[PDB]
Design a protein around this ligand. Structure first.
Ligand SMILES: Cc1cc2nc3c(=O)[nH]c(=O)nc-3n(C[C@H](O)[C@H](O)[C@H](O)COP(=O)(O)OP(=O)(O)OC[C@H]3O[C@@H](n4cnc5c(N)ncnc54)[C@H](O)[C@@H]3O)c2cc1C
Ligand SMILES: Cc1cc2nc3c(=O)[nH]c(=O)nc-3n(C[C@H](O)[C@H](O)[C@H](O)COP(=O)(O)OP(=O)(O)OC[C@H]3O[C@@H](n4cnc5c(N)ncnc54)[C@H](O)[C@@H]3O)c2cc1C
Ligand SMILES: NC(=O)C1=CN([C@@H]2O[C@H](COP(=O)(O)OP(=O)(O)OC[C@H]3O[C@@H](n4cnc5c(N)ncnc54)[C@H](OP(=O)(O)O)[C@@H]3O)[C@@H](O)[C@H]2O)C=CC1
Ligand SMILES: NC(=O)C1=CN([C@@H]2O[C@H](COP(=O)(O)OP(=O)(O)OC[C@H]3O[C@@H](n4cnc5c(N)ncnc54)[C@H](OP(=O)(O)O)[C@@H]3O)[C@@H](O)[C@H]2O)C=CC1
Lengths: 401, 401
């Protein structure tokens, strides 16, 4: 079942969470983690916010305290694994044996093919190294072009604007945050960023670039000092594909984290997995999934009577004045709006229903309502829609029933 | 690896092919097959053609000669399996032990929700029982409505027209065969069926029905004596889902037929698997996949040095005067047309290319060209596009190089 020794590939949040849970659950056998970045394991969300702005990496490290007696092979790349021999080949020339192999290799940013041969700075934002490079190439009154209106681009937009950087943003879709956000939220978010001076360009794609100017598909030009591309990520599933595991931009796993290869597990951003709400497989890229799927897989490995991973997806995104929280599905057959949707001290809550049942929720600058909404979502609650809209209703009270 | 005893769930083409290959490859341990239909195992394509027209089921049975010493439990439903206990629970009250479990349970037709409460005959066409019922409810000059312009509906359309049945066909898409057919082929096929008297209704959906009349979304009505619904199939993956395997309208498998559950394999229509051409996972519903994936999985189970399943997808469809064969992707960046596309003695070949490389092909009434085109497709050939178009070119010769 859980067979020693355990080897984990990747040393991000998912991996750290997994190995800390193994220890906490009582596994005392060998754990070796292989991490290609030569960095003390660290959390990524500050890279678009407080780290980007203030630059102290020692405030963003992950705590490995709950993972004692782990050897972390930092700055080392796993090059292949042989699932028959039960071995992993490392870039430093060593080989690791394993009883259980855990793939927690995450995802890497998609490149924009039309900027491949560019002769101006073009960066993506995923690592400490990326953050440091983008940080050092921006100055107040510089001109930053962001490609992609996802949460990373928008988080960077906010931070750049606060620093006095002029920001343009090109998005292929008619709206921002098309991945996992209610249209009502996306529209408001566009309203917010436009008011903070972001120059938004919708339904535009980059067709190429020439000597410091980016070219768009509507025949026009944008001049920038730097391009940051944030058009999503792609699973780091190369080792899995080579070794014969089922993959498709992500390693297919069940609720136990099992791949199609015996004794090989996967978790976090690298996985394609079931979303219990939609009942479909999806590659979930959220911080909460990385942590929670990692814990769930570990728990069940040590104690096979534990249930499989069962959490419903949620995320937050901090974008300047907007502290955004989103849980569940972006849409249902009904949206209930609690509060006013206003740039004047923004504060509101959205609730998505499907046939009377809560299937998703959004809070903007309203954390207190988000926890109880997540509880209602989990148990498939069907509150009175009238009470859901009524400002006088205590969602915390409601949730407690 | 291959651990006795072997239990297979489902007794269709995929299952028969799998168990015959196990025997041929040298496995001599127990094989028990559980098949819910109380029928000698049989092939389905004649159900829309020669069986529908002539009604002799003894011409459509699968040969189990190459699968000696197999117990076929016909008319028995597997209700669950316990992958820990390594047992399968049967509807007759018995339990089967297994060393290796193989899920070959196929797929069932999708129902049309707007006809659920209908009070006129509404059938789907998948089994011998379906065929017999549709057969007995049609008469010459009866009015048949077919919902769905896939190969099954079109095959039935042809057979019904030949029998003197009036046929209407409603399709949601602007074209027929939207699943896996080049647009050039689909357009011609519509031309053919219209000329044979089929009343085609595109971009229409059924909204319901009232007392022998079907209602459409454009506010209109179609009167028919019988509706046959052919809007695709859904994987029979219930046992897999309950048992904790990764599934999403189909059981995820790698090229060895492995699911995410140790000692459980799956093959045929029930599987979601990698299409090597598109590099994406797909549920492939072709006869050739059922047979060939079943053989490939068996071969590798007996002999683990054998390669995994590697075939590229292809199918045929016999529709009246049109003997259609299609291999690979429906489209690339270029289509080459060999011959004239004409209702006057139809005979032509399409070739789809992607950056010089053959990625798909179609033959209509030209079997001799289809085999060599499949060989060129397999090795990713890049023939001179000029020679591909030139009528004087021998594709068989070309393929032999
Ligand atoms: C700029 C930024 C802002 C973010 N803000 C938010 C946010 O507002 N909200 C939110 O929910 N999430 C946010 N995220 C955080 C995010 O969701 C987590 O970082 C992520 O989900 C963690 O997943 P992971 O541990 O599986 O993968 P990763 O963090 O990618 O870790 C995988 C590691 O494995 C390494 N690796 C890959 N292949 C190999 C190999 N062969 N050998 C060794 N190592 C290998 C990778 O390089 C990587 O270091 C943000 C991320 C970024 C980059
Ligand atoms: C009308 C018709 C026309 C066709 N014509 C074409 C064609 O022109 N071209 C083409 O390429 N293909 C055609 N097909 C044939 C087709 O592609 C094959 O029949 C199919 O791919 C076989 O897949 P299978 O063996 O995996 O599944 P199936 O044939 O569905 O066999 C699975 C069996 O398992 C049974 N089962 C499911 N659950 C359980 C359980 N819990 N316990 C026991 N048994 C269970 C099912 O009832 C079924 O009998 C046609 C099919 C039909 C119905
Ligand atoms: N469910 C989840 O997994 C969610 C994850 N997050 C976060 O998302 C982050 C990563 O994604 P991010 O970088 O922000 O970008 P996104 O994945 O959000 O994508 C942003 C936009 O880029 C567009 N795009 C994608 N591909 C291309 C392309 N080839 N050319 C031009 N445009 C393209 C997309 O449009 P289009 O749709 O047309 O391709 C999309 O509108 C992760 O860090 C994660 O934390 C946030 C919410 C939910
Ligand atoms: N690659 C493969 O797997 C292929 C399999 N085949 C054969 O396909 C057969 C089964 O499919 P078949 O029954 O013919 O139908 P199809 O899967 O071909 O679908 C036919 C049409 O039905 C429409 N449709 C689907 N769902 C609905 C719905 N809920 N309401 C209204 N219309 C809908 C589809 O449109 P829409 O797209 O909008 O949903 C589609 O255009 C199998 O027997 C197999 O042999 C043939 C070629 C390739």
């Amino acid at each position: 079942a859980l067979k020693a020794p355990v080897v984990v590939l990747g040393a991000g949040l998912a991996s750290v969470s997994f190995v800390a849970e193994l220890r906490q659950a009582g596994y005392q056998g060998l754990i070796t983690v292989v991490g290609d970045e030569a960095e003390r394991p660290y959390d990524r969300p500050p890279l678009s916010k407080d780290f980007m702005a203030h630059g102290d990496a020692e405030k963003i490290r992950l705590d490995c305290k709950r993972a004692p007696e782990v050897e972390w092979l930092l700055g080392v790349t796993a090059q292949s694994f042989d699932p028959q021999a039960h071995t992993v080949a490392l870039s430093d020339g060593r080989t690791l044996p394993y009883g259980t192999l855990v793939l927690a290799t995450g995802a890497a940013p998609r490149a924009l093919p039309t900027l491949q041969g560019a002769t101006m700075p073009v960066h993506t934002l995923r690592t400490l190294e990326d953050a440091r490079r983008i940080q050092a190439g921006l100055r107040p009154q510089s001109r930053l072009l962001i490609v992609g209106g996802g949460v990373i681009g928008l988080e960077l937009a906010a931070t750049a604007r606060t620093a006095g950087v002029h920001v343009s943003l090109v998005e292929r879709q008619p709206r921002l945050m098309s991945r996992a956000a209610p249209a009502t939220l996306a529209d408001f978010v566009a309203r917010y960023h436009a008011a903070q001076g972001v120059d938004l360009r919708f339904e535009r794609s980059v067709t190429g670039s020439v000597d410091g100017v980016v070219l768009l598909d509507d025949g026009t030009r944008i001049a920038a000092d730097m391009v940051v591309v944030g058009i999503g990520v792609l699973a780091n599933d190369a080792l899995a594909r080579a070794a014969g595991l089922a993959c498709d931009d992500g390693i297919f796993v069940d609720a136990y984290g099992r791949t199609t290869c015996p004794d090989v597990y996967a978790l976090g951003d690298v996985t394609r997995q079931r979303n219990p709400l939609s009942g479909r497989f999806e590659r979930i890229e959220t911080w909460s999934n990385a942590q929670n799927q990692g814990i769930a897989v570990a728990r069940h490995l040590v104690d096979p009577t534990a249930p499989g991973y069962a959490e419903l997806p949620w995320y937050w995104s901090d974008q300047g004045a907007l502290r955004i929280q989103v849980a569940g599905l972006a849409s249902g057959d009904e949206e209930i709006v609690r509060g006013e949707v206003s740039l004047d001290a923004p504060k509101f809550t959205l609730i998505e229903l499907q046939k009377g049942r809560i299937v998703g929720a959004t809070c903007v600058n309203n954390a207190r309502d988000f926890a109880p909404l997540r509880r209602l979502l989990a148990v498939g609650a069907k509150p009175d829609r009238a009470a859901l809209a009524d400002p006088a209703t205590d969602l915390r009270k409601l949730a407690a029933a």
